[PDB]
């Protein structure tokens, strides 16, 4: 009844100078569960809330390892995230083999941006439906990066992606000044609090539903799940 002739393909440009399919793909990240990433002077932490098909089911893994110094959290289509994760792991291993140097995180995010851009400009290709929050430590320092289905990438002091992400972003912006000087324990607590804002009032963060990944000057990327998240979870105050 209100059909649009210009939304059929990523190649078609609308008369308003917008590509509709890229915008539709950008909405795919919002379908995925909320993920919060924040950084301090010495550490970068990604905190994500997993969801499960059934009580018996284990829970999907939002956070993945890319390299010793780089870790990513996925929101949006999981299959696209697996393709991107495999590409990122190969680039990092190549950098260690050729230069014996951890690949700078900024160069990796640029390569992901190039790979994502080609589906947007070519026929019969869907733009990737996954948004990635990337946590890394390099010579420059701890870095948090956001990638979009549009192929744009952003350096962020802190970012939240997924459903109800805006509530987390309002908390992250409110307390961002405190984040730079925070110790690892406090920085993780701030991320859990932002993720808590996304959660509905009845639901609360649990060891089963929360995944935390932290990279730092002396810490290789480590994913803490289930019992491992319990020390970080115990410190957090009760929901306001």
């Amino acid at each position: 009844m209100f059909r649009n002739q210009y939304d059929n393909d990523v190649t078609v440009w609308s008369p308003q100078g917008r590509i509709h399919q890229i915008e539709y793909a950008m909405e795919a990240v919002k379908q995925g569960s909320a993920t919060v990433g924040l950084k301090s002077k010495t550490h970068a932490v990604l905190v994500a809330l997993k969801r499960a098909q059934s009580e018996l089911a284990a829970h999907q893994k939002k956070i993945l390892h890319v390299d010793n110094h780089i870790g990513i959290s996925i929101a949006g289509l999981t299959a696209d995230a697996r393709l991107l994760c495999n590409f990122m792991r190969q680039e990092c291993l190549d950098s260690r083999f050729v230069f014996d140097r951890p690949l700078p995180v900024s160069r990796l995010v640029s390569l992901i941006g190039s790979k994502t851009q080609i589906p947007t400009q070519r026929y019969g290709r869907r733009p990737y439906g996954v948004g990635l929050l990337i946590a890394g430590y390099d010579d420059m320092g701890p870095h948090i990066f956001q990638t979009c289905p549009s192929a744009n990438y952003f350096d962020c002091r802190a970012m939240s992606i997924g459903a109800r992400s805006q509530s987390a972003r309002t908390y992250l912006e409110r307390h961002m000044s405190e984040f730079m000087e925070c110790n690892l324990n406090e920085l993780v607590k701030h991320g859990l609090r932002a993720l808590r804002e996304t959660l509905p009032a009845e639901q609360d963060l649990t060891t089963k539903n929360v995944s935390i990944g932290i990279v730092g000057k002396d810490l290789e990327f480590t994913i803490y799940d289930d019992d491992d998240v319990s020390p970080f979870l115990e410190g957090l105050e009760e929901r306001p």
Partner: protein, 838 residues
Amino acid sequence: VENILKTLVKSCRPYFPADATAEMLEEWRPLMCPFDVTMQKAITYFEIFLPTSLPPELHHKGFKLWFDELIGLWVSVQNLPQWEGQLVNLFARLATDNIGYIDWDPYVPKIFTRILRSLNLPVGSSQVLVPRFLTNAYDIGHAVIWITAMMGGPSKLVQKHLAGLFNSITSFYHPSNNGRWLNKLMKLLQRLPNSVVRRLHRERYKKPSWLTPVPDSHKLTDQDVTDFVQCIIQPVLLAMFSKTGSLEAAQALQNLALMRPELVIPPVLERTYPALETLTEPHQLTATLSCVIGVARSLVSGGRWFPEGPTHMLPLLMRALPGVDPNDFSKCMITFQFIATFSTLVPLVDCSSVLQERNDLTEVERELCSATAEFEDFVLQFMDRCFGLIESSTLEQTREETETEKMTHLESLVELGLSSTFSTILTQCSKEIFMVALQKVFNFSTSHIFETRVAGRMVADMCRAAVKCCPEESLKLFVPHCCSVITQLTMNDDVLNDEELDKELLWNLQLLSEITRVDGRKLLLYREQLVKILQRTLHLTCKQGYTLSCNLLHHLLRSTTLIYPTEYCSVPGGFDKPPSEYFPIKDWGKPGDLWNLGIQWHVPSSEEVSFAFYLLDSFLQPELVKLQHCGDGKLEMSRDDILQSLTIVHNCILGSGNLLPPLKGEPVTNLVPSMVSLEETKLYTGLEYDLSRENHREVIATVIRKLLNHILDNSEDDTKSLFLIIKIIGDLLQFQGSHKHEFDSRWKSFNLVKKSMENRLHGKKQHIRALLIDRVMLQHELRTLTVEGCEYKKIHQDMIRDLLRLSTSSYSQVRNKAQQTFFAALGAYNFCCRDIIP
């Protein structure tokens, strides 16, 4: 034979004897065995013969006798048999004929279930298909008559059931849920409003007759019409955006708007304004605009229930102006139809001054007068958009070897649409608005030179339309400039010898030829200039440039020798009135009156006919004398000279066909013999031929026969000359100033305009003045075209034998053209075929 016989019995069924129904039942009641095939024969006879048109007093003699038995069989037969379709058709006829004399309510739930089953909509996961469900095929047309017939009366069961049917199938009407079911569903949407509007016309606006009137108790109340529109409006609005195309929705809206404009016009308008603005949703614009054409008559003149009414017309027309464009043909054509329909309905005159001078106008009328100020902006902007379409429509030949020299059907349609829309805008324009328009067309055509094949034809048509609206002023600017450019260019005198003329000369010759067609009296003032141009141009060697001059002669002769209606205006004698003498906003919409139509007819004057004879003597007679010499062994002339001379003669026959009397000769002696007289019918058709002057048609016939004998004997390879001879023999045999093909196209156009501008509820009493003038012209054209009973004659026999000689010629192309003319001639003369067969 079957269809003619079925209509014949149906025609005599109202006049059958009173006791006929009882005897008909006795004859076909034995054949009614359900298992036997004779049941179908019995039902078929019952549908064709049983009389439902009997007076209420004699109802016992007819319908009462069989209604219970046949209706009982229909409810009882759960399997769908072939006869059920015939049975439902009979019930629908009975219901419409006896509106208030049948209960209907006991059987109403079953009928609605069987009609819903007929649509064969898919429901449920299994969706199994049962054979013979498709075969029953309850017809939508008969079902719609049955539903409309049972509507009305104290009981509201039928209206409640109709709402239930529409509520149940609404999802199917949605554009996304398209499928096989859409064809029947769309037919239901278009037919049901048409039936209700017809029923209301019979009850309220139809003259009383022997046929029984609807009982006042069962007459549809205003609430009943309000309920019907509310039930069907939501499905119709979804159907407007249907992928099928929205023709069915537009027709349904047109009927609904007559019944209740306030309920139906605003929802369509709410969609139309966004559709014009949207850039990402193209389909909406065509669908919404077509629906606005359907409700156009209601919105412009309807203020009682739709007070806003005409206020919306001016904004919509301006918003549609971007629609004319080279890129989209369909948008351009729908926009042209939209601009033409509104323009014909609305007098395009500014009355903004009236608000200050006179008070007491209604608040809506005051807004209308303020809006009239922008009418001049709209016409000039339409011309600006049209100039762009013409500029981007240049043929631009890309092949070095050949030139296209032709118009594609799509470009012909855009030229026809642009010409028609521009003509309507100018005819309704006030003289002050027209004069600014005249300068704009004159400057555009004069300033630039255009290719004659496509763009030039379109520019000339816009210029020709401007000349028709006000001939004295338009000819005064156009005729001198075109003549001056042609005379200056042709002064060299080597131009006549040159092959390939100056493009400017070719354009001015096309412009002069097209502007020429108009009232003959107007052409007379410039008669001397036109003859001088014709004398130099007619003998130009170039094929293009002598054709254009020959077209000028044909148009000049046709304009002065034919009877045609000049005004074609919405309001009689209007738009030139002194300001404040006539108020235009009152005449918005407003149907013309047949008695007060005041059609202005051009009847050939004595001066015009004398000029036509002078032109025929000046040009046709010199070519005829050369052609006669060529037929004899004298004045040998080139094939190109013969073709040029034949072109001159053919154009003269076409231009003056009405003036030249029909060929006459002694009748063929051997023919079938009849005791009763066999006389050709005679119709006056105006004019009255001049007996004293020698018949040019007779002199053309003698020379053409002589030339044919010479060409076949000597230059048998001159195919181009032979084609012209075939055309001339056809014109000599059957031309009286009207072309059969032209009449057919005009008749179809009259039917096409009539459907959009016809108010079924109020009947023919309200019809637009322009269409009524066209119908009177069509009747005059019918008289000239209809010739019956003509005697075969010796002259016709010789021409038909000559057509047969061409029909057996060496070249297949000559044979094909001759054979079509030969077949046409055989029908015209009585007993002609029997003589030709040996």
